[PDB]
């Protein structure tokens, strides 16, 4: 296991393997934080999230 | 939903109810944005004139978060056909935007590639729906969740009595009484990764609910995905 085989490539959420490197995404509605991994919604109810 | 779990408060604020003329919900939905509802295909035949309902986890009473939305346009998918469920998939752009709140969100749309690979290979999914607690029965009045296990594809054809096209896959159990049923089509299909729930699957058909051998089919979310924003686009 490498890159997003391993443990999704320490991404929050979409991993993809652009060269042989690990790039991080996240679906609408976030955006994805300074480390490049975490993914932080944008406004109030980010999709696919529990409320309270 | 045979066996599974009441939702409880906030917890599948993604369920969307299509309601008749007369307010009985007759199907599921997944809502994918303050516009569009997710749904299958063969639930538009079900009901000549219908609405959507949303925030609704208790069809008895008022919970105070229920929203009724008109829908504005029906955007089925030309290739589905009665004959074998194929193409079992529809979007609903709504006239007014829905208000997200406590129990109304909406759950993410995943890229292919990773869904795939990192979503379908998990142990389980998640279906939610108000549809049947029994093969024979009323519509729950509550709204129900299940987690469903991932069905290896081979085993899932060689259950089949009919044809398992590459736009559906299994889920469910072998023996176990837990199972969607009558009144969950439509509904969402959910995988959970690091506490974000994503789109998998919409509730299609089973031979019967919860039966020996049998599993619960869905529509493979990710063979729709760039349909689905071809249609959410207009
Ligand atoms: O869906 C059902 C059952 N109806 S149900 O309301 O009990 C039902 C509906 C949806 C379900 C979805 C899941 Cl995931 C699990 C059980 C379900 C049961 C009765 C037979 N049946 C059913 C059985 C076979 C087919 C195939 C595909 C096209 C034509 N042959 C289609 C069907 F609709
Ligand atoms: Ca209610
Ligand atoms: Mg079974």
Known sequence: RKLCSLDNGDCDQFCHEEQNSVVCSCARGYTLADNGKACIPTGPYPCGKQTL | ?234
């Open chain 2, 1 to 234: 939903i045979v066996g599974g779990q009441e939702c409880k408060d906030g917890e599948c604020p993604w369920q969307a109810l299509l309601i008749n003329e007369e307010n009985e919900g007759f199907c599921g939905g997944t809502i994918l944005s303050e516009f569009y509802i997710l749904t299958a295909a063969h639930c538009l035949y079900q009901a000549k004139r219908f609405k959507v309902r949303v925030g609704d986890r208790n069809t008895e009473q008022e919970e105070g978060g229920e929203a009724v939305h008109e829908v504005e346009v029906v955007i089925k998918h030309n290739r589905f056909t009665k004959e074998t469920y194929d193409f079992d998939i529809a979007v609903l752009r709504l006239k007014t935007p829905i208000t997200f709140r406590m129990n109304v969100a909406p759950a993410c749309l995943p890229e292919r590639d990773w869904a795939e690979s990192t979503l379908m290979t998990q142990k389980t999914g998640i279906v939610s729906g108000f549809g049947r607690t029994h093969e024979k029965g009323r519509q729950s009045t509550r709204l129900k969740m299940l987690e469903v296990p991932y069905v290896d594809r081979n085993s899932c054809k060689l259950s089949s009595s009919f044809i398992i096209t590459q736009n559906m896959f299994c889920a469910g159990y072998d023996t176990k009484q837990e199972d969607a049923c009558q009144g969950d089509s439509g509904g969402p299909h959910v995988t959970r990764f690091k506490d974000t729930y994503f789109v998998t699957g919409i509730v299609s058909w089973g031979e019967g609910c919860a039966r020996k051998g049998k599993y619960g089919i869905y529509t493979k979310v990710t063979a729709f995905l760039k349909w689905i924003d071809r249609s959410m686009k207009t």
